[model samples]
Structures are given as structure tokens and as C-alpha cells.
Target: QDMSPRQSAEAFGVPAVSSSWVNQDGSTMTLVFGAGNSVSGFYVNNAPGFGCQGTPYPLVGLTWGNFIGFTVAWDNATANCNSVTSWTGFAEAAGSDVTIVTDWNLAYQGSSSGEIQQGSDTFTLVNKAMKETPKM
Candidate 1:
């Protein structure tokens, strides 16, 4: 039946849902979970602008169910508010220490005459697996 849209086999190696976020404005985002709703990462344009901030745009993400969204590569038209343009919300869970709560509702792109900037952001989820790998 066209290989169907029936999904979820651990959602295909999501690997603990690939966690790494910190965008409280320090600019860092990573979500590597491919297949299913798809994802690819990098979004560090740390916003002090004019020189393109901290630099690392090429992210592409999308999800449903727990609901998340992403897209950052603002390649023009006065550079898309210098920071964000795609961020859909809701991903709040609790194991006790604020992990992966990438909330949303922020679309920015101000000044070609101004007015197209709104807000809401919080992306705290950390622990880079202890930084030296292999101890599982």
C-alpha cells in the first residue's frame, strides 16, 4: 500500500531522542533524529548580528506527536530578523532536571521598514554525554 505511513519502530534509532539544546540565547541547537518526522542539526546564530552572530545555520527539523519544529538558514532578504524564523512548540517532559523542553512561538525578521518580530523561546537540554565518549 505504497509502503504506508504507519510508523514507529522505536521511531528508527532516535537514540534517546537525540538531545542537545541550550538556546536561552546562547545559541545552540542539535537534534539529529532522522526518519519519522525528520531532523538534521546546527543553529547557532548567537545574535549580536551584522557579522552573522555565532554562525552555524543549516538545521532542518520537524516533528509531531510531542510537537517540535525547526528551520534556520535564513539566506537573505536582509537576513531574516538576524535570528529565528521557525519554531513550533510543545515538548515538555520531566525526569526531574529540565531536559529537552524546546518550547516555541518565535518568528523574527525585522526591518525592511520594520515589524515582523515576535517572541517566546526556551531550549534547555544539556549533557553532551560526558564529552569523551564510550563508557556505556
Candidate 2:
């Protein structure tokens, strides 16, 4: 079956939500869902030395569940590989970027409220409900 990021995130936890990308990118992103824990977010890329360069977005107390996941928003930003603040429009191109973003939209069911970017790639978690929740 086809699994979206949010659905995968909800069913198997944060690591599962990003397992493939981590493998492909040669890095891991730790996403903390509620509680005072350490969460790591990632920047999408195509080349080995492309976007974000494996920068970890240290997040705290973010919510996660069976109905939530992360979303990436690609915009008109410069394509830089070292900094999250110096990029936009994705690592590959506009169309591929939209495909990724659309997948996230479907995953989260159109419920995202935050944004993070790394070298031309911006993303956010589809978080609408917030509380002291536990890791599923």
C-alpha cells in the first residue's frame, strides 16, 4: 500500500516517518512528539552534497500521533547546501519539489502550522492539536 509521511509517522513513530529519506541522505532526523525530548528535523536533497548538508533541527515538545506527520514547503529561496536559511524551491527543481510537498499535504491531511528551511527547501510539521502527549 502507498504510505504517506503523516500516516507513516503516526503508525510507526518519527523514525519510521523518515526512515527512507535518512537512508537515502545518509543521515537521521530526530523528531520529538510532545514531552521534553530532543527532536531532529532534516532538509531534503537529491545530491550527496546538496541541501541542508545534514543539519539537525533541534525541536522540543512537538506533537505526533496516528494522524500527524511532517510537511515540506518549497518556495523561492536560494539553493545553498550548508545553511537552512539560505535556500528555497527544493534541491532538484520546482516540479519535483511540488511532488514532495503534495505528498506531505496528503499525509498531514492539510494540517500544518510551522515552517523550517534548509538550502532552498522549507518544511513544517502538520500540527494542529498540541498538548502533553506521549510517543506513540
Candidate 3:
């Protein structure tokens, strides 16, 4: 009996995997991370239709689930070529940064027409003590 498939610790409090779906035409949809608290902001790259450019994307009608302390968000840009962006509604490390991007070929997005799916990466706010120490 292996629980690894079902039970595993995540970067944040509760465990939630970031998922995505992409259309053949390049349109993508994604379910980034979410916190019990309301969406504080959004991370966007090459945001055209949304009209943000490069700033904290706000959460309007977006719903928040039960899972405070941890956060999950997504990035939906019409054109980015191929790059990574952060959508997590949390703080970053003192030195390093987290990368959040969608996989067009890995996920399953619905058919293309009037609807375009979005995608994002996952960010888990962990305790400094939990981080592994460098041997160097």
C-alpha cells in the first residue's frame, strides 16, 4: 500500500497541485494556487487584452477556497513566446525567486473558438527552517 500517490507534503500548508490545459491554437487555461483568503493580486506577462503590462494583476470575480496561509494564482497572456512568470499571491525568497509557467504540450485544454484557456505554476510558502541547508 503506497500512499505517496495520494498523500504527500507540499510547499505550503495543504497540498494542491498546479494544473493546466492548452488549446491547439495556443490559447491556454490554468488553475494556479488559491488561498482561503481573497485574491490579493495577479502576476502577468505580456498581458495585452487584460491590460496590465507588468504589475500585480487584481482578482475581481475570482473565488477563493478554504486554504489560508497558502496561495495559488495563474497567468494568462495572449503572447509571450515562451517564458516563466510568478502568479502566486505570496512573498518571494530573500535572494532567489520562484518560477511559474504553463506547459502547452503537457496539459489538456478545451477546443478553441470563443474560449481561450489559461495556465500557471505553483508556489508554496514554506518556513525558513524547512528549507534545506547548503553544504557549501
Candidate 4:
């Protein structure tokens, strides 16, 4: 079978490698995978979430095929912290759950000098956000 990122992004909405993940300060994140392996979404920080002083940060990411690796960028955009994350772990989410190993660094310009981190997160696939049509 041929695997298409856009197909899964549209059919499932969330991948089994990056979805409903949590942050240290208790905020959660959900990502949307678009055409061309482009990942996009928004996430909020609370009371110094990554030292940005609390606000929403829209993100941009790119995946490497159907694998467990992606490079993401957190667009500072005037009200949030700019950051970059390179993650790799587990296999592609073929209707299954996987882990995302994260390596990131929040840029300076927040409430402080910023910080670096290395961690991992578990991801699960999501149900259709879709239509009705099935063949037998």
C-alpha cells in the first residue's frame, strides 16, 4: 500500500507520533499535519511556559516521510517564545502509537536567557475530524 502524508493528515487529523502531548508546566499540545508533511498548530504556555512568560505560540514543523523524526519551529511572532525542536523516535504511526524523542532550545528574548532540553513524548492517533463513505 502507498502511504501519503496528506491522506493520513486528512483522514486521521492526528498522527500516532505526535498528539495530545503535555508540557512541564501542565499545558498540552495538539498538532495538525498538512500537505507535504507540513505540521502546523498552536500551543499555549502558562506562567513561564518555557520562559516565554505565558501566551500562545503557533508552530511549524516538517516530517521525514512516515518516520519518527521531525523538525519544528515555534514562531515567536511578537507574543511568544521562538524555539526549535528536532525529534526522532519509534516508527511511523500506521494506525498505532509511538514515542517522540525531543531535542529543543528556546531562543533568548523571553523573561530570561532561555533553556535547552532533551526529552521524549508518547503520541496517539485521533479519530476522523470527517465524512461518510465506505465500500465493501
Candidate 5:
């Protein structure tokens, strides 16, 4: 059985942000919106439904104070958070759902710091809002 976006949203008790029937590689991506303009609970291929194979861990924000908003990126093969910089900071395992801590005291708008994981690799999160404000 295939998983639907509605199913993913319902599982997480949130509204569906977006859902894809299939990707370029025949994979699916389902995203849901949670509280605080945060996004949570995604469905990716790897199982009959959503599990932890192709899903992105934790959540990513679309809006920040003044910085660039977070864009959706993932490692579908291993289901990991994509890191572009140094992989040093808070440590956690991939597929581990954790609430990240934010630091608002910064020159940029909506600056935040936290930790995320993908498989055995962990990353320190430093983010700025790409969008001015996210629509509710």
C-alpha cells in the first residue's frame, strides 16, 4: 500500500503543506505544517508507507526573521539531513525526532542554532530565514 499526504498529515495531526505523487526517481514527498510556522512529519518512499527510510528527520522552517528561509533538501538514499558546512555541534542519531533549540539574539532575523541527524552523521544547525514571514 502507498502512503498519501493526507495520511502523513493525519498521522502527525497537522495540515498538509504539500504532497508529491512521485519524484524524478519514482519517490514520494509529503510535507505537513506544524505549530510555530514549523514543518513536521514527512512521508518518503522506502516502505509501503512512511517510516524513516526516505523521510527527513526533525523539521525545517520555511520562514525566518530576516535570513533565508529553509529549502527542502534530503538524502533519500539514507534519509538524512543534508549539511553544507561543518558537521560539528549537537549530536543526535538520524531518524530521531527532536525539538531543536533556537537562539533569537542575533543580528539577522530569526537566527537559530540546534542539532539534527541523518543516519550516524550529526550536524549543528545554524539557520536564517529565507522568507520574511511564512503564511499561516
Candidate 6:
């Protein structure tokens, strides 16, 4: 598979890896994957309702095509203090859920567009603010 960072960015409509950011207030946090100022992060797999697949080890803020095989969700937020677990589930119509899998430094977050790297995978880093697609 020809994994071009540029193509993936355009294809996924967001940058991957170092190009994304996650909003954090202590432990509770959310992903902010693209260049937009919206609070919501990126969606994967098919569409909004459509499921996404990721590899066992994926990177934050990067998107992958057929090369990575399974679709995985990437969360770069630190663990939440009030929550029992590192992840916090949002009560949306689709019941969107997220987890602070990696406790990355706030410095890694991106304020603008960044480069998309191959093998690495990123999601809409911010929060699910506006619906990027129609309901599944």
C-alpha cells in the first residue's frame, strides 16, 4: 500500500500524528484531530454511525488507509481524575465514547494543520462538536 502522508491527510480530512491536539483539564480530556477550530475530533471507519478499525498500536492524530488493516481510535488525553477509568463516555445520539489512552504532554497538541505520517493513525482530536457526516 502506498501510504503517503499527504494523501492520507486529504483523504481523511485531517492531519495525523504530530498534527493533532487533545484538550485536557487535568485528567479529563478529549481529542482535537483536524485543523478546524471545532471542539469535536475526527471520525473513523465508514462515517458517523459507521465503525472504524485501527491496529493494536496506533498513533494519535494520524489517519491510515488499507495499510494499517484494522481501524483503531486514538486518544491522547491524560487520565481523568474524577472518573474511575481513564476513559469517559459521552451521551450522544450515537453514544460516542473516548478514553485517555496516552498521557501525552500538552505541548504535543497542534494549534493548526500538521503533517500526516504513515503507519501512524489519528482521530478527530477535539470533541465531537459538529456532526461531520449524516447519521448512520
Model 3 lDDT per residue over 1-136, tens place: 3223112213322333333322223333333443432223333334345332443332321222222222223334433322222222322233223322322111223356333344443432322344476664
- Candidate 2 per-residue lDDT over residues 27-114, each given as its tens digit: 3333433322212354444336434443444322222233323433322244432222321111112321211121121111113654
- Locate the minimum summed-lDDT window of 10 residues in model 4: 98-107
RMSD of each: 13.2, 15.2, 13.0, 7.6, 17.6, 16.1
C-alpha lDDT of all candidate models, in order: 0.56, 0.32, 0.31, 0.50, 0.33, 0.29
Model 3, poorest ten-residue lDDT window?
99-108
Best by lDDT: 1
- List the candidate numbers ranked by TM-score, top first: 4, 2, 1, 5, 3, 6
lDDT of 3 at 85: 28
TM per model? 0.26, 0.27, 0.24, 0.49, 0.26, 0.21
* Model 1 TM: 0.26
Residues 25-116, model 6: lDDT tens digits: 22122233333211233322221221122212232333333111122234324222111111222211122232222322211223474333
Taking all chains together, the TM-score of candidate 5 against the true structure is 0.26
Better of 3 and 4 by TM-score: 4
- What does candidate 1's lDDT look like per residue over 1-136, in tens digits? 1111223112332235566777667777777765657767777657444345665667777665556677775554334545446776655555424434444443445556434444567776676656585565
- At residue 2, give the lDDT of candidate 6: 57
Candidate 6's TM-score reads 0.21
Per-residue alpha-carbon lDDT of model 5 for 1-115, expressed as tens digits? 4345454333333233342223333333334444454444343434343234555433354322211122334445565433321111221213323212222111111237554
lDDT of 3: 0.31
